[PDB]
């Protein structure tokens, strides 16, 4: 198939700024006639909506704010300037060749000052232990930018088996990001160890934010 | 105006098949190709194929060449997509679109062998203070989590559910002034309408 590569994978911008998204074709996307490069706009939970078709054509309803350019294999979506309702994920797509394919998408997000994650760890709840399982929860809240790493340690040594993770989209209030990490074990192997640690490394600090606890205390 | 009414959410088990629907409104059925795009939660968009009601002409991508079956009833201006021999990896949202011009809300398909399972709610007990609670081992989605019945809205953080052995599991955190706790009551409210279950869990110090 023809590969449509779309950059950036994520575009931090400030309300008011202009925004240029890029889409590059694997081969010239001109049919005998027009060029079937299209830009779509999709928000969380909703279907995508058409903004631009045939490279530069504004779909009915979309404001002059949006603009399309490019030719052959190089295309550009231009948002001048950016609004609240513009914040979301943008896709390009080709229809000249076939099969018809889409770009990986671009995440349009708000720019803000960097923020330090608030790490919080929690031992298996009393209620869960008497049930049979044991989950240790590590909360990484309100940090920026979104990129971050999680590292579970048990009694010193690293644990990666049984660690699940879940992230949140950019907060609509303070534009920060957050994630959760749950280390799941059995009651038996859980009460077999003492030191339970999680290290959140972020660009903010060169020293990994470390929250730990002992079952002894 | 163009309008696409897609069948509701579908829950079926592996090895089976589904027939999703897409009812076209606002236009001459035979003017618009019907496109079928797949989007696996959090992932990108994948073109599956298309059914053109004008000549019943169809196209299948390699990955759905055997499984899928695109159809349409010009009588009720509705187009169907049938996917056969389903697997867990077929679990995604399936849009039908009037040739990429307009897209239906889509149909979330959940292929699984799991039976309705009520979640277990556990409290996460410990200048601000951060509390939370784990909602483990439920099926199917979704689940509801509020704090103080919704009174606490600023500072809350509900994380997407993960899938662990058929059963979904999510958590949720809330951060309140350490002065107002445990001085003041803080309780998370959990709801799983599928199993018709509801659980309130007051967060108390260790």
């Amino acid at each position: 198939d023809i590969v449509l590569t779309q950059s950036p994978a994520s575009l931090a911008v400030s309300l008011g700024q202009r925004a240029t998204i890029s889409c590059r074709a694997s081969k010239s996307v001109s049919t005998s006639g027009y060029s079937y490069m299209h830009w779509n706009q999709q928000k969380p939970g909703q279907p995508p909506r058409l903004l631009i078709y045939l490279v530069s054509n504004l779909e009915s309803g979309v404001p002059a704010r949006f603009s399309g350019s490019g030719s052959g294999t190089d295309f550009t979506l231009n948002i001048a300037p950016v609004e609240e309702e513009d914040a979301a994920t943008y896709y390009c797509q080709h229809i000249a060749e076939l099969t018809r394919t889409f770009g990986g998408g671009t995440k349009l997000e708000i720019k803000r000052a960097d923020a330090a994650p608030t790490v919080s760890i929690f031992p298996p709840s009393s209620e869960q232990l008497t049930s049979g399982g044991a989950s240790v929860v590590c909360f990484l809240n309100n940090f920026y930018p979104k990129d971050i790493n999680v590292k579970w340690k048990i009694d010193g040594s690293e644990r990666q088996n049984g660690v699940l993770n879940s992230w949140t989209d950019q907060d609509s209030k303070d534009s920060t990001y957050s994630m959760s990490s749950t280390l799941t074990l059995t009651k038996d192997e859980y009460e077999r160890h003492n030191s339970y640690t999680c290290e959140a490394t972020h660009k903010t600090s060169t020293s990994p934010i470390v929250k730990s606890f002992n079952r002894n205390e | 105006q163009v309008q696409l009414q897609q069948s509701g959410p579908e829950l079926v088990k592996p090895g089976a098949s589904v027939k999703m629907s897409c009812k076209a409104s606002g236009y001459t059925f035979t003017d618009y190709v019907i496109s079928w795009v797949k989007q696996r939660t959090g992932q990108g968009l994948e073109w599956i194929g298309e059914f053109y009601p004008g000549t019943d002409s169809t196209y299948y991508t390699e990955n759905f060449k055997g499984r899928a079956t695109l159809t349409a009833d010009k009588s009720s201006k509705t187009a169907y997509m049938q996917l056969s021999s389903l697997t867990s990896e077929d679990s995604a949202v399936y849009f039908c679109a009037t040739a990429f011009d307009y897209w239906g809300q889509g149909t979330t398909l959940t292929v699984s062998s799991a039976a309705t399972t009520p979640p277990s709610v556990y409290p996460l007990a410990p200048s601000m203070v951060t509390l939370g609670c784990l909602v483990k081992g439920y099926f199917p989605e979704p689940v509801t989590v509020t704090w103080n019945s919704g009174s606490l809205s600023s500072g809350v953080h509900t994380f997407p559910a993960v899938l662990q052995s058929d059963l979904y599991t999510l958590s949720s955190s809330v951060t309140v002034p350490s002065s107002t706790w445990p001085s003041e009551t803080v309780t998370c409210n959990v709801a799983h309408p599928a199993s018709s279950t509801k659980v309130d869990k007051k967060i108390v110090p260790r």
Binding site: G33, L54, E59, I95 | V33, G54
Partner: peptide, 15 residues
Amino acid sequence: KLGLITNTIAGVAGL
């Protein structure tokens, strides 16, 4: 046939 809306497609995929 004939009447076919070609905003984001060129034609049917079936050939």
